[PDB]
Amino acid sequence: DVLSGLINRRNSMARNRVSHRYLSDEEMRVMYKAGLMSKIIRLKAGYALNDTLKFESTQDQEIYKKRLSKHVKNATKFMLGFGRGVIVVFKNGDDLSKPLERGVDPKLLKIRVFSGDIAKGNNPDNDLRSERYYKPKNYTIKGHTIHWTRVVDFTYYMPSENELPDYYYGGMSESELIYEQFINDSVVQRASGSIIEKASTFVYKIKGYKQLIQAKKEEDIIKYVSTCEDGRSIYGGLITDADDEVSTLTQSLTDLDKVDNVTLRRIAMVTGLGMTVLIGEQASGLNASGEKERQGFQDTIENLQSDYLEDPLNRLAEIFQLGFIEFKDRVEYDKKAVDVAKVLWELGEDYGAYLKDKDVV
Amino acid sequence: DVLSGLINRRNSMARNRVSHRYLSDEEMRVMYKAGLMSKIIRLKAGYALNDTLKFESTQDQEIYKKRLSKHVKNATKFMLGFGRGVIVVFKNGDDLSKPLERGVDPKLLKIRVFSGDIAKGNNPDNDLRSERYYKPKNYTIKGHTIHWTRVVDFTYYMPSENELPDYYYGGMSESELIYEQFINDSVVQRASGSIIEKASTFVYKIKGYKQLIQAKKEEDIIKYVSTCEDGRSIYGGLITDADDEVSTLTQSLTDLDKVDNVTLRRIAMVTGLGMTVLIGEQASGLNASGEKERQGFQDTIENLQSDYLEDPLNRLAEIFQLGFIEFKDRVEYDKKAVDVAKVLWELGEDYGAYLKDKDVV
Amino acid sequence: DVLSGLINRRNSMARNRVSHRYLSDEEMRVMYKAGLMSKIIRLKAGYALNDTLKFESTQDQEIYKKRLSKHVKNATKFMLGFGRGVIVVFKNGDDLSKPLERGVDPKLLKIRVFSGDIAKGNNPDNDLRSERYYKPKNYTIKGHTIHWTRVVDFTYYMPSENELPDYYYGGMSESELIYEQFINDSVVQRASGSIIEKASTFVYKIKGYKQLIQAKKEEDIIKYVSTCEDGRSIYGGLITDADDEVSTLTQSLTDLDKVDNVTLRRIAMVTGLGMTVLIGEQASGLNASGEKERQGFQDTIENLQSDYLEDPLNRLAEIFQLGFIEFKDRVEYDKKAVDVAKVLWELGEDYGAYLKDKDVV
């Protein structure tokens, strides 16, 4: 697809090579505040944790729930916001070093949650012995420092190892995924507001106003126009001159909808949320109940649920002696099938063996 | 379709011959970070591994799942991202040479996962004896080196052998499949954001501003325009001159939607994901549950499931003494048929033989 | 339809005669790498082999499957990619000559797969005795050579015999079938990306810039424009001259969609895949499950299944002592009919004879 001219050079192929921005931590902070991604972070985090946690420990049901299931949500928000959510646990005595797990701390401990801004990862062992180049070995949360096994890390989508330090050992803010986007949409929107005030400008092309400004005795013509504009309406006709010329100029974003369309399409892609939510027509098919509507993007959340939330939640599960915690997605839909399972046999009367391996309860 | 003129030469036939870019490893790295393919890699990898793994070893059910089924997902992501996903296994003692499979390592071993960036393939035996020109015999993961039977390779779509070294013995990043695309879409999008700010420019064609700049005493006219623009609105009419001329110029991407359409169509093709997902209307028919919605592109994933994931997973299956692992795709849909199977005979009462060879459980 | 003028000569009838390109092997290689046909080759190959193989040998069920059913898929991919897929079998001792089938090799043998690039066909017997002008008698895979009965050939759509050597005795790459296409679409697409960056160019038709360049003291006017362009927005109006003239020019592919439409229509034709897949709306009616969606083009695959895959698979079937292997295309759809078959007689109670000659199991 390249020959016989200089087409070879000026096409989009060779005219530009690929490169990716590394948005700074301070810029990462700002987008966490900005309204658009604020819902992005809130939506995706909630869609991951809102009553979606399969607990295999019925006894002391969801002691996770009343204590730190709310800490994790702020922390897993800090995942998406900054690429590094952090949960810090330590006993009543502040310690730089590891938690004494010889007798695993029986709820004699406190809980902290930290954004990737103030948190960070420091020390990787370059050898293959304990934890590979990925996992840090000790890093500072503040002026203080916290041991590796002390701390639980909510790490998002990680890049290749050759550049993992540039994200300081963990995750990638959604901003870094859509920094192309949020800037563009903001540009779309800031321009959107200011176009209307300049949508059409009345113009008094007035002969001699050359001179009046030039003689700086232009005070009166401004006054007359100001009085004239103070009343220019459907009801009173202008009075101007043959040599005068009143005209009207319009300027407006001719393709505001197209660009706002393109920018929003991508954000739906990269974030994984539907197009409908960005437009705001949440009523249609993107909802809470998982019958068919949460199914609209549950795959993305499930992709989130089994990639960056399973690692630390399982690690958090063991540190509190809780069981292995997973996710698995009303039942009235299934009940009609349940009766079908019952009516399978009726061997006189015998238990439908398939009743148990469904939503019997 | 060629005669009687110079048409023979200038048509798209002979005016350009075919050639394919070889995007470098560093460019391969960047796209892994970029937002668009980040969802591509995440989506396709998740759609392949999310609870789609038929385990013939019910005993110790899915010991794969809690240990390295998450390692593979990062690794099979590294398949799509770079054309080479790698899983490295070795005992507590670092070894260049082969793993001692005389007694196959009974879970006394560690697990590593590596991108095709830092990983690579080195040594092919050109003879036909053991492993053909395809399979390497020993390659370096870093400064270190790892034996062939030590390492498990997640190799994507491979090119012809005559050029296999140029991809360093395995796979092809999706980027290499859509480098024509990601560049084009990025070009579409970067231009999309900047067009609005220049969608319409107000112009003061002003007589004499020739001279004012030329006499470099143009300070005042800029000041007046700056004050004038500071208030140009629907509410105050401009005051200019007969010789003056205010005009407005609009520039905008006349076919932004068309090109953005064409680029997105192809990415849906080559990646295999639907058009709906790229647009972001994931609610319609591309979902998680495989009843009818995951069926939207499950063939592509199944094509992925039985091409580049079966090889190494089966190899990984044997190295851990796990059974042969495959894939096979709720049941309430099938249950109504199940009752039909039961009501087939009712020979007095006899077992429906067809009950077993379906989803009885 | 020809008379009374020179219309006879300039119409599309006589103005051009038909001729077909013979794309070289190196160009055949490149398209195998290119993203578009990469899915073409992957899709069609998978649609042919993914769990579509009727095995009449239930005993040792699908020993084909775990050993070389994956070798064939890479090989049948090499069919479509290059017009020649090759499977090579030989014992532990490398041999130029035929495999000793006096005692047919009881799985004491290795397996190789080769693209039509490095493989090729050499020696046809022009006599009608053993194998006609079609079938080669011995050809080189590399520097080495392999006997005819040693090797299994995946030969695609073959041309007329008068020109069979120009394809070197077997098949035709899909590229050769759509070389008109892939070039055209690539031309469509490469131009598609570069049109937006030039969709509209701001122009400063400036009086006197004739001279400033001519006096080569044009440094300042570029600087002012560069500063001016550094801020040209909706918010600040240009300042230019009466003799000056700012204008905007737009250029864009007026019929980008039409040509991209025509090119994609044909590729759907020649490859046999639907139009929907090329567009990327795979969700609609082109899927994996063969109930109604795979039926969208299953005829093309069935046409592929009984033309170029039956020959060598059957040949491969005998060489491994496996039975004759064919293809034949869920059952819950058929089960309601199955009960209808049962309720046909109820002669007291008697077996529905039609139960067996359906999907009883």
Side-chain angles (χ1 to χ4, degrees):
Chain A
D1 52 2
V2 298
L3 182 62
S4 160
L6 74 165
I7 287 150
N8 271 12
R9 173 164 173 263
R10 283 169 208 276
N11 64 7
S12 313
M13 281 325 317
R15 214 171 61 71
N16 63 186
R17 316 190 181 268
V18 65
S19 74
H20 173 224
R21 187 147 157 83
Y22 290 135
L23 62 84
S24 57
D25 202 297
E26 65 97 13
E27 301 206 300
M28 202 166 318
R29 253 201 312 284
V30 160
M31 286 187 196
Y32 194 108
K33 283 174 291 177
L36 174 49
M37 271 168 97
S38 76
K39 205 50 179 157
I40 300 298
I41 297 169
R42 267 173 295 161
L43 274 173
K44 217 182 306 177
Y47 282 137
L49 277 299
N50 292 338
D51 195 54
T52 318
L53 282 74
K54 164 77 62 154
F55 281 21
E56 68 93 20
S57 60
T58 292
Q59 277 206 65
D60 268 340
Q61 170 202 357
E62 307 181 322
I63 187 74
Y64 181 76
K65 182 69 176 177
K66 327 162 209 198
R67 184 177 179 179
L68 73 165
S69 79
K70 215 205 296 191
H71 271 275
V72 65
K73 179 159 166 53
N74 296 115
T76 188
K77 268 188 205 183
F78 289 165
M79 185 180 288
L80 282 72
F82 302 101
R84 175 42 82 72
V86 175
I87 297 169
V88 176
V89 61
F90 58 92
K91 64 177 72 175
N92 285 358
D94 309 348
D95 292 329
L96 283 72
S97 46
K98 42 185 271 303
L100 274 297
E101 60 100 19
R102 48 150 185 252
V104 287
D105 298 333
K107 66 164 154 302
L108 311 177
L109 60 83
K110 300 176 183 171
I111 295 307
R112 305 288 179 277
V113 292
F114 284 72
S115 300
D117 178 12
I118 47 180
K120 205 155 258 195
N122 188 359
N123 189 359
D125 292 331
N126 214 337
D127 213 28
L128 321 179
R129 280 304 283 150
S130 175
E131 269 67 43
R132 180 66 179 87
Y133 187 76
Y134 306 102
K135 305 316 182 215
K137 195 193 141 43
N138 179 7
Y139 50 64
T140 186
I141 201 70
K142 274 253 191 203
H144 272 290
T145 52
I146 311 167
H147 208 104
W148 181 65
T149 177
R150 279 272 162 125
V151 60
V152 174
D153 49 345
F154 280 158
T155 61
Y156 203 69
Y157 172 90
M158 286 169 281
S160 163
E161 293 84 303
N162 194 7
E163 52 162 348
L164 183 62
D166 266 347
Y167 286 75
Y168 264 81
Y169 300 160
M172 201 176 258
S173 158
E174 321 311 306
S175 299
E176 278 277 353
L177 310 171
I178 57 178
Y179 182 85
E180 177 74 30
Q181 304 324 339
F182 175 86
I183 290 312
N184 270 322
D185 183 78
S186 300
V187 173
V188 176
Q189 184 177 2
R190 160 197 63 190
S192 66
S194 159
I195 191 49
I196 293 174
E197 293 279 54
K198 290 182 275 298
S200 69
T201 64
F202 204 59
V203 171
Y204 290 84
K205 293 173 58 196
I206 279 181
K207 188 140 213 164
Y209 180 97
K210 194 44 42 193
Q211 285 72 38
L212 277 296
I213 299 287
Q214 271 194 351
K216 199 185 287 186
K217 178 94 166 297
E218 52 94 23
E219 182 65 26
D220 283 18
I221 183 178
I222 296 314
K223 197 48 67 204
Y224 263 100
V225 171
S226 196
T227 63
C228 182
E229 290 271 278
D230 262 355
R232 179 172 72 105
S233 302
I234 303 95
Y235 310 148
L238 277 296
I239 317 288
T240 54
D241 293 332
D243 311 78
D244 268 333
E245 183 178 1
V246 286
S247 73
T248 187
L249 294 188
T250 189
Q251 65 182 177
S252 165
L253 323 177
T254 69
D255 291 331
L256 171 72
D257 63 358
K258 277 166 153 62
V259 176
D260 178 35
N261 181 309
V262 171
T263 302
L264 290 174
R265 299 263 269 276
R266 193 52 54 94
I267 297 192
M269 179 95 175
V270 176
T271 61
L273 312 163
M275 167 50 94
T276 59
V277 65
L278 294 175
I279 290 171
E281 282 159 348
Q282 194 79 307
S284 168
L286 260 54
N287 301 94
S289 54
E291 314 295 289
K292 191 253 181 192
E293 313 324 307
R294 185 183 46 132
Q295 178 195 3
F297 59 90
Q298 177 81 356
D299 51 359
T300 290
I301 296 315
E302 188 160 336
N303 194 357
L304 206 60
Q305 275 171 192
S306 293
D307 197 354
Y308 316 121
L309 295 201
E310 172 147 19
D311 263 352
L313 261 53
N314 206 118
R315 159 75 190 203
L316 196 145
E318 61 86 10
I319 198 165
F320 286 177
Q321 288 76 251
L322 277 296
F324 294 98
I325 59 171
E326 294 103 299
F327 318 116
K328 186 65 222 77
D329 286 8
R330 297 270 88 186
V331 187
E332 79 263 4
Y333 277 26
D334 214 325
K335 289 177 66 172
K336 281 305 280 191
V338 168
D339 182 87
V340 161
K342 162 74 174 216
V343 303
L344 294 174
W345 311 61
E346 271 66 12
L347 313 183
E349 178 58 32
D350 195 81
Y351 296 103
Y354 182 76
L355 280 148
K356 194 93 71 203
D357 183 348
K358 273 320 289 178
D359 265 339
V360 63
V361 67
Chain B
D1 52 2
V2 297
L3 182 63
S4 160
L6 74 165
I7 287 150
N8 271 12
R9 173 164 173 263
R10 283 169 208 276
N11 64 7
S12 313
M13 281 324 317
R15 214 171 61 71
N16 63 187
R17 316 190 181 268
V18 65
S19 74
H20 173 224
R21 187 147 157 83
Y22 290 135
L23 62 84
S24 57
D25 202 297
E26 65 97 13
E27 301 206 300
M28 202 166 318
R29 253 201 312 284
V30 160
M31 286 187 196
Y32 194 108
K33 283 174 291 177
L36 175 49
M37 271 168 97
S38 76
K39 205 50 179 157
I40 300 298
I41 297 169
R42 267 173 295 161
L43 274 173
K44 217 182 306 178
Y47 282 137
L49 277 299
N50 292 338
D51 195 54
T52 318
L53 282 74
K54 164 77 62 154
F55 281 21
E56 68 93 20
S57 60
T58 292
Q59 277 206 65
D60 268 340
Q61 170 202 357
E62 307 181 322
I63 187 74
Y64 181 76
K65 182 69 175 177
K66 327 162 209 198
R67 184 177 178 179
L68 73 165
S69 79
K70 215 205 296 191
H71 271 275
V72 65
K73 179 159 166 53
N74 296 115
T76 188
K77 268 188 205 183
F78 289 165
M79 185 180 288
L80 282 71
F82 302 101
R84 175 42 82 72
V86 175
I87 297 169
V88 176
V89 61
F90 58 92
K91 65 177 72 175
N92 284 358
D94 309 348
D95 292 329
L96 283 72
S97 46
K98 42 185 272 303
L100 274 297
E101 60 100 19
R102 48 150 185 252
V104 287
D105 298 333
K107 66 164 154 302
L108 311 177
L109 61 83
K110 300 176 183 171
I111 295 307
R112 305 288 179 277
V113 292
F114 284 72
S115 300
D117 178 12
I118 47 180
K120 205 155 258 195
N122 188 359
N123 189 359
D125 292 330
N126 214 337
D127 213 28
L128 321 179
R129 280 304 283 150
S130 175
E131 269 67 43
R132 180 66 179 87
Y133 187 76
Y134 306 103
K135 305 316 182 215
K137 195 193 141 43
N138 179 7
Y139 50 64
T140 186
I141 201 70
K142 274 252 191 203
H144 272 290
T145 52
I146 311 167
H147 208 104
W148 181 65
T149 177
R150 279 272 162 125
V151 60
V152 174
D153 49 345
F154 280 158
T155 61
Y156 203 69
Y157 172 90
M158 286 169 281
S160 163
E161 293 84 303
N162 194 7
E163 52 162 348
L164 184 62
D166 266 347
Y167 286 75
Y168 264 81
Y169 300 160
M172 201 176 258
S173 158
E174 321 311 306
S175 299
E176 278 277 353
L177 310 171
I178 57 178
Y179 182 85
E180 177 74 30
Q181 304 324 339
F182 175 86
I183 290 312
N184 270 322
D185 183 78
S186 300
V187 173
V188 176
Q189 184 177 2
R190 160 197 63 190
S192 66
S194 159
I195 191 49
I196 293 174
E197 293 279 54
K198 290 182 275 298
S200 69
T201 64
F202 204 59
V203 172
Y204 290 84
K205 293 173 58 196
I206 280 181
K207 188 140 213 164
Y209 180 97
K210 194 44 42 193
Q211 285 72 38
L212 277 296
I213 299 287
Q214 271 194 351
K216 199 185 287 186
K217 178 94 166 297
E218 52 94 23
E219 182 65 26
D220 283 18
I221 183 178
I222 296 314
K223 197 48 67 204
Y224 263 100
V225 171
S226 196
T227 63
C228 182
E229 290 271 278
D230 262 355
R232 179 172 72 105
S233 302
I234 303 95
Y235 310 148
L238 277 296
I239 317 288
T240 54
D241 293 332
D243 311 78
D244 268 332
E245 183 178 1
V246 286
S247 73
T248 187
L249 294 188
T250 189
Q251 65 182 177
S252 165
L253 323 177
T254 69
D255 291 331
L256 171 72
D257 63 358
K258 277 166 154 62
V259 176
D260 178 35
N261 181 309
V262 171
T263 302
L264 291 174
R265 299 263 269 276
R266 193 52 54 93
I267 297 192
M269 179 95 175
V270 176
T271 61
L273 312 163
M275 167 50 94
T276 59
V277 65
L278 294 175
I279 290 171
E281 282 159 348
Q282 194 79 307
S284 168
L286 260 54
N287 301 94
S289 54
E291 314 295 289
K292 191 253 181 192
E293 313 324 307
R294 185 183 46 132
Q295 178 195 3
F297 59 90
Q298 177 81 356
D299 51 359
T300 290
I301 296 315
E302 188 160 336
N303 194 357
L304 206 60
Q305 275 171 192
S306 293
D307 197 354
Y308 316 121
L309 295 201
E310 172 147 19
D311 263 352
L313 261 53
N314 206 118
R315 159 75 190 203
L316 196 145
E318 61 86 10
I319 198 165
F320 286 177
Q321 288 76 251
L322 277 296
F324 294 98
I325 59 171
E326 294 103 299
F327 318 116
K328 186 66 222 77
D329 287 8
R330 297 270 88 186
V331 187
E332 79 263 4
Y333 277 26
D334 214 325
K335 289 177 66 172
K336 281 305 280 191
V338 168
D339 182 87
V340 161
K342 162 74 174 216
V343 303
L344 294 174
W345 311 61
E346 271 66 12
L347 313 183
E349 178 58 32
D350 195 81
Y351 296 102
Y354 182 76
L355 280 148
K356 194 93 71 203
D357 183 348
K358 274 320 289 178
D359 265 339
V360 63
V361 67
Chain C
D1 52 2
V2 298
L3 182 62
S4 160
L6 74 165
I7 287 150
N8 271 12
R9 173 164 173 263
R10 283 169 208 276
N11 64 7
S12 313
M13 281 325 317
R15 214 171 61 71
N16 63 187
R17 316 190 181 268
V18 65
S19 74
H20 173 224
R21 187 147 157 83
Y22 290 135
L23 62 84
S24 57
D25 202 297
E26 65 97 13
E27 301 206 300
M28 202 166 318
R29 253 201 312 284
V30 160
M31 286 187 196
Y32 194 108
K33 283 174 291 177
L36 175 49
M37 271 168 97
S38 76
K39 205 50 179 157
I40 300 299
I41 297 169
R42 267 173 295 161
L43 274 173
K44 217 182 306 177
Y47 282 137
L49 277 299
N50 292 338
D51 195 54
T52 318
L53 282 74
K54 164 77 62 154
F55 281 21
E56 68 93 20
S57 60
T58 292
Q59 277 206 65
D60 268 340
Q61 170 202 357
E62 307 181 322
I63 187 74
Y64 181 76
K65 182 69 175 177
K66 327 162 209 198
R67 184 176 179 179
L68 73 165
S69 79
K70 215 205 296 191
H71 271 275
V72 65
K73 179 159 166 53
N74 296 115
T76 188
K77 268 188 205 183
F78 289 165
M79 185 180 288
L80 282 71
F82 302 101
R84 175 42 82 72
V86 175
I87 297 169
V88 176
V89 61
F90 58 92
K91 64 177 72 175
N92 285 358
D94 309 348
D95 292 330
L96 283 72
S97 46
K98 42 185 271 303
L100 274 297
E101 60 100 19
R102 48 150 185 252
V104 287
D105 298 333
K107 66 164 154 302
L108 311 178
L109 61 83
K110 300 176 183 171
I111 295 307
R112 305 288 179 277
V113 292
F114 284 72
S115 300
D117 178 12
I118 47 180
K120 205 155 258 195
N122 188 359
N123 189 359
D125 292 331
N126 214 337
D127 213 28
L128 321 179
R129 280 304 283 150
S130 175
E131 269 67 43
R132 180 66 179 87
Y133 187 76
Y134 306 103
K135 305 316 182 215
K137 195 193 141 43
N138 179 7
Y139 50 64
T140 186
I141 201 70
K142 274 252 191 203
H144 272 290
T145 52
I146 311 167
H147 208 104
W148 181 65
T149 177
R150 279 272 162 125
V151 60
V152 174
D153 49 345
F154 280 158
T155 61
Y156 203 69
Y157 172 90
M158 286 169 281
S160 163
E161 293 84 303
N162 194 7
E163 52 162 348
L164 183 62
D166 266 347
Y167 286 75
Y168 264 81
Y169 300 160
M172 201 176 258
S173 158
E174 321 311 307
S175 299
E176 278 277 353
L177 310 171
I178 57 178
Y179 182 86
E180 177 74 30
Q181 304 324 339
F182 175 86
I183 290 312
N184 270 322
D185 183 78
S186 300
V187 173
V188 176
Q189 184 177 2
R190 160 197 63 190
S192 66
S194 159
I195 191 49
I196 293 174
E197 293 279 54
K198 290 182 275 298
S200 69
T201 64
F202 204 59
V203 171
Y204 290 84
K205 293 173 58 196
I206 280 181
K207 188 140 213 164
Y209 180 97
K210 194 44 42 193
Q211 285 72 38
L212 277 296
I213 299 287
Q214 271 194 351
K216 199 185 287 186
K217 178 94 166 297
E218 52 94 23
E219 182 65 26
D220 283 18
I221 183 178
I222 296 314
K223 197 48 67 204
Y224 263 100
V225 171
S226 196
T227 63
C228 182
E229 290 271 278
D230 262 355
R232 179 172 72 105
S233 302
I234 303 95
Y235 310 148
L238 277 296
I239 317 288
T240 54
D241 293 332
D243 311 78
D244 268 332
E245 183 178 1
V246 286
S247 73
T248 187
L249 294 188
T250 189
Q251 65 182 177
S252 165
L253 323 177
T254 69
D255 291 331
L256 171 72
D257 63 358
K258 277 166 153 62
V259 176
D260 178 35
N261 181 309
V262 171
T263 302
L264 291 174
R265 299 262 269 276
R266 193 52 54 93
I267 297 192
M269 179 95 174
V270 176
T271 61
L273 313 163
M275 167 50 94
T276 59
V277 65
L278 294 175
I279 290 171
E281 282 159 348
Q282 194 79 307
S284 168
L286 260 54
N287 301 94
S289 54
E291 314 295 289
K292 191 253 181 192
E293 313 324 307
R294 185 183 46 132
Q295 178 195 3
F297 59 90
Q298 177 81 356
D299 51 359
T300 290
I301 296 315
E302 188 160 336
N303 194 357
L304 206 60
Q305 275 171 192
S306 293
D307 197 354
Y308 316 121
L309 295 201
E310 172 147 19
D311 263 352
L313 261 53
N314 206 118
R315 159 75 190 203
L316 196 145
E318 61 86 10
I319 198 165
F320 286 177
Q321 288 76 251
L322 277 296
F324 294 98
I325 59 171
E326 294 103 299
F327 318 116
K328 186 65 222 77
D329 287 8
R330 297 270 88 186
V331 187
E332 79 263 4
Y333 277 26
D334 214 325
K335 289 177 66 172
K336 281 305 280 191
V338 168
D339 182 87
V340 161
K342 162 74 174 216
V343 303
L344 294 174
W345 311 61
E346 271 66 12
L347 313 183
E349 178 58 32
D350 195 81
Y351 296 102
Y354 182 76
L355 280 148
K356 194 93 71 203
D357 183 348
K358 274 320 289 178
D359 265 339
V360 63
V361 67

